[PDB]
Write a protein that binds this ligand. Structure first.
Ligand SMILES: C[C@H]1O[C@H](O[C@H]2[C@H](O)[C@@H](O)[C@@H](O[C@H]3[C@H](O)[C@@H](O)[C@@H](O)O[C@@H]3CO)O[C@@H]2CO)[C@H](O)[C@@H](O)[C@@H]1N[C@H]1C=C(CO)[C@@H](O)[C@H](O)[C@H]1O
Ligand SMILES: *[C@@H]1O[C@H](CO)[C@@H](O[C@@H]2O[C@H](CO)[C@@H](O)[C@H](O)[C@H]2NC(C)=O)[C@H](O)[C@H]1NC(C)=O
Ligand SMILES: *[C@@H]1O[C@H](CO)[C@@H](O)[C@H](O)[C@H]1NC(C)=O
Ligand SMILES: *[C@@H]1O[C@H](CO)[C@@H](O)[C@H](O)[C@H]1NC(C)=O
Length: 863
């Protein structure tokens, strides 16, 4: 074969002819760098035995192992293929052991399919028998999307592999990793996935979460597809320039979904329709969050809070890290250093702010009659810990408080215990949201305080290239035992089960409210429950650059509320870096400045009351808050439809191949282009301006650039923000908290396209009740402008905000002078508004107007 198509037969060691021969593979060392010297032969694997059988849902096939050397042990002789034409755009196939039940992910959202093959498929499936392969092609153009024929199917108990050709190199996704770029390097790269507490740095290791989804943009027409593997065992994904991708996992089953869409966004919508769309956040979670590890005392925390409030920083949320606890134990506070914590909570609340508390899964096991630790006693009484391999002894590890046991969040009763612990603590400290951390789960000892037994779970025949090369490193023994199964199988599901339990707890502690959950470890579908942050980064320019692809990727995974620690967790942050990162950070969907222990303060007001950093931070945060109605509506669409929030340029501009690798800029939704300075010393940025009309956000002037690379001038106080022609942006006068800003006058920004038309929408509900979308208690309105006329149209009208909200300002960009501006209500005029016009900038602002939110209006003008 073409060397780019070789599928490596020796993933586990340096390639030798002797091993190649024993494995029945092909040997050819004469390739280029990273081209496998030993690769699978053309007929190695499985063949279809007999006929495929039609089922109501699709078909099944029996696959029989063609005689083969047992490399990673216990091979599976009879494999069952079950294929289901689940929807017109989603294909599901699974390969199981015909004769034995194997571990399958007990996902909380995904259900087994019952019912019949879908009509009007956008795809076709083709099965080859001798040797087995499966191919999924797009019906419209016969483009081959998934094609396993490039390599073997391998299916041993602890080694399962399938490959697929890909129709392009525009591949985005997989996680959790620092990829450094957004479009994948298809040049022989292997990405291990196994939830792990480690530093998101340049080493390309497995990190906190496990995300097997990827999306492929087929060509400039926008046609795209995506693939998801429902498997929670350690795995790695191998990318090569064929182009092709190989999944290699060490247990469970190969359970694949293939999704087709007409655009990249439609693929994401299809993926999220399957795994679970993201929670609609509390509107307050959209504001700016502040945090650090080790304020040390409530006095220190209060001083930080107070200087940022004194500076009028938009600032909704304060996080309290493990320093609030009594000796780093959950569900206590330090009665000396945090004496008066409940009074401080009241102060936060009186100022319109929210408290988010960190909670760790591990529970101190140090409790006596003399000094009881309630959470451990109650947990032991309920028998809800993760056990050792004997199945009866709670496993002992070590985390922040010292020796600890670990809750088994897969046990339904564990959620009852967890809920009661939060109820009890909420009675003392009235926190508003929960930050779940260390939930990979992270262990300061490897496996347990007594290590791990040598066995096939702790020491498997094949180990993907995870950091440190052992599964149990900085986590639990793989033979530890939980309600859903052994840690070997469910390790990647710990943070997911914990988020599910935590949301369950919120039902009791925050009745009928969304609250906020922020989680470190994630699995596919975690976004239904929680926000995410990109973990323990560093105050470097590299970390700032690497943040954007990480944010875009999590939006693909349906965790749109995601961001890094702005300014950098580890290390003292330089002023210039923190200023640039604050500017960018004002536009991360989850915007939090957080800092590690002992490092110099990096909260915005710490740089000085009159500093450039503070001024610019406040400035761009005030822009974020102004655009919160737009951001919120983008979250409404992510929740209800499955759209991304932070979005790659290529999701909107896929026709333009110059956007396919852009990862130094991004969009909010379709209409706002963010262009940060990402280089030390720079007052410029080399940026791409897509094929659209664009307007400078602050001045409203139309840029001359279109569909081209530019050097954008961005001095130390600026970040690029441009509005897309053809879009209408709802705004609301900002205040330093969202409690307050939500009572303010609204505005519209109408950015006219080349045809002097534009469209937009606004979702509005109470900002905090759970299920307002499912129960249809909300306002959705639509704005459109087509020559001389803005129409405000109400499509859903079941919530009326009691604060008398109205649009009191309309700003029109790219317009000739309007004249004779008329306002009609339900067709009835209806008042002559005030119009200000800038003939140099071609901007009109209409004021002295009061268009009540929830009412239909026409605003008309002449030229
Ligand atoms: C607070 C943090 O502590 C732990 O991580 C720290 C490591 O223990 C240190 O070894 C050091 O890591 C360095 C690596 O060893 C080195 O290989 C290189 O990559 O640089 C690293 C530093 O950049 O520093 C680590 C912290 O930077 C622990 O493993 C980690 O999970 C902890 N972070 C969480 C805990 C808290 C405190 O409640 C929160 O504040 C954080 O946001 C959590 O993410
Ligand atoms: C971990 O071990 C404990 C025992 O230490 C198991 O607790 C059992 O729980 C069931 C259901 O709650 C009770 O009916 C039994 O009486 C408990 N056994 C004992 C010996 O008390 C628990 O099931 C274990 N967890 C897992 C995942 O196996
Ligand atoms: C990679 O990891 C090592 C620890 O093994 C660390 O010291 C180093 O800084 C990392 N390198 C990069 C490029 O991030
Ligand atoms: C902003 O909120 C404060 C409460 O902190 C309130 O006093 C004030 O009236 C609000 N002002 C605005 C922006 O209209």
């Amino acid at each position: 074969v073409n060397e780019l198509e070789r599928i490596n037969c020796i993933p586990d060691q340096p390639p030798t002819k002797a091993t190649c021969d024993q494995r029945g593979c092909c040997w050819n060392p004469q390739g280029a760098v990273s081209v496998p010297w030993c690769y699978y032969s053309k007929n190695h694997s499985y063949h279809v035995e007999g006929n495929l059988v039609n089922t109501n849902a699709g078909f099944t096939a029996r696959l029989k192992n063609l005689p083969s050397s047992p490399v990673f042990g216990s091979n599976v002789d009879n494999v069952l293929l079950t294929a289901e034409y689940q929807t017109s755009n989603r294909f599901h196939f699974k390969l199981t052991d015909q004769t034995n039940n194997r571990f399958e992910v007990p996902h909380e959202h995904v259900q087994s399919f019952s019912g019949n093959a879908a009509a009007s498929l956008t795809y076709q499936v083709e099965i080859s028998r001798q040797p087995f392969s499966i191919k999924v092609t797009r019906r419209s153009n016969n483009r081959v999307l998934f094609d396993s024929s490039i390599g073997p199917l391998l299916f041993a108990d602890q080694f399962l592999q399938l490959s697929t050709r890909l129709p392009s190199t525009n591949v985005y996704g997989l996680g959790e990793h620092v990829h450094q770029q957004y479009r994948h390097d298809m040049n022989w790269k292997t990405w291990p996935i196994f939830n792990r507490d480690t530093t998101p740095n340049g080493n390309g290791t497995n990190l906190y979460g496990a995300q097997t989804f990827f999306l492929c943009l087929e060509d400039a027409s926008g046609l795209s597809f995506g693939v998801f593997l429902m498997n929670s065992n350690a795995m790695e994904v191998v990318l090569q320039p064929a182009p092709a991708i190989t999944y290699r996992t060490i247990g469970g089953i190969l359970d694949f979904y293939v999704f087709l869409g007409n655009t990249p966004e439609q693929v994401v919508q299809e993926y999220l329709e399957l795994i679970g769309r993201p929670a609609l956040p509390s509107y307050w979670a959209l504001g700016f969050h502040l945090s650090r590890y080790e304020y040390g005392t409530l006095d220190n925390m209060r001083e930080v809070v107070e200087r940022n409030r004194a500076a009028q920083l938009p600032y909704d949320v304060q996080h309290a890290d493990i320093d609030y606890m009594d000796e780093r134990r959950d569900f206590t506070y330090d009665s000396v250093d945090f004496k008066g914590f409940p009074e401080f909570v009241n102060e936060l609340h009186n100022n319109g702010q929210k408290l988010v508390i960190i909670v760790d899964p591990a529970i101190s096991n140090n409790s006596s009659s003399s000094k009881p630790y309630g959470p451990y006693d109650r947990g032991s009484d309920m028998k809800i810990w993760v056990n050792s391999s004997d199945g009866v002894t709670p496993l002992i590890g070590e985390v922040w408080p010292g020796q600890t046991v670990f809750p088994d969040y897969t046990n339904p009763n564990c959620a009852v215990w967890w809920t009661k612990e939060f109820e009890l603590f909420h009675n003392q400290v009235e926190f508003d949201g929960i930050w779940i951390d260390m939930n990979e789960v992270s262990n300061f000892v490897d496996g347990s305080v007594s290590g791990c037994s040598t066995n096939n779970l702790n020491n498997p025949p094949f180990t993907p290239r995870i950091l440190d090369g052992y599964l149990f490193c900085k986590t639990l023994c793989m033979d530890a035992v939980q309600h859903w199964g052994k840690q070997y199988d469910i390790h990647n599901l710990y943070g997911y089960s914990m988020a599910v339990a935590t949301a369950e707890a919120a039902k009791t502690v925050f009745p009928n409210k969304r609250s906020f959950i922020l989680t470190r470890s994630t699995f596919a579908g975690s976004g239904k429950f929680a926000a995410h942050w990109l973990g323990d980064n560093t105050a470097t320019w590299d970390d700032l650059r690497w943040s954007i692809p990480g944010v875009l990727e999590f939006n693909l995974f349906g965790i749109p509320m995601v961001g890094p620690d702005i300014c950098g967790f580890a290390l003292d942050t330089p002023e210039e870096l923190c200023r640039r990162w604050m500017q960018l950070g004002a536009f991360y969907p989850f915007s939090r400045n957080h800092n590690g222990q002992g490092y110099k303060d990096q909260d915005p007001a710490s740089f000085g009351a009159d500093s450039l950093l503070l001024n610019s931070s406040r400035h761009y945060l005030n822009i974020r808050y102004t655009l919160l109605p737009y951001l919120y509506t983008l979250f409404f669409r992510a929740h209800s439809r499955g759209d991304t929030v932070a979005r790659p340029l290529l999701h909107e501009f896929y026709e333009d191949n110059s956007t396919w690798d852009v990862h130094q800029q991004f969009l909010w939704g379709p209409g706002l282009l963010i262009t940060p300075v990402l280089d030390e010393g720079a007052e410029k940025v080399m940026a791409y301006v897509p094929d659209a009309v664009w307007y400078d956000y602050e001045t409203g002037s139309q840029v001359r650039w279109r569909k081209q690379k530019v050097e954008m001038e961005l001095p130390g106080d600026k970040i690029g923000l441009h509005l897309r022609g053809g879009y209408i942006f709802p705004t609301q006068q900002p205040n330093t908290t969202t409690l307050a800003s939500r009572k303010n006058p609204l505005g519209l920004i109408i950015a006219l396209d080349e045809n002097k038309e534009a469209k937009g929408e606004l979702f509005w509900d109470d900002g905090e009740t759970k299920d307002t979308v499912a129960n249809k208690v909300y306002l959705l309105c639509e704005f459109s402008v087509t020559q001389n006329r803005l129409e405000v149209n109400i499509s859903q009208s079941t919530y009326k905000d009691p604060n008398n909200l109205a649009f009191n300002e309309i700003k029109i960009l790219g317009t000739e002078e309007p004249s004779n501006v008329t306002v009609k209500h339900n067709g009835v005029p209806s008042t002559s508004p005030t119009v200000t016009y800038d003939s140099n900038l071609k901007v009109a602002i209409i004021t002295d107007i009061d268009l009540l939110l929830g009412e239909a209006y026409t605003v008309e003008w002449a030229h």
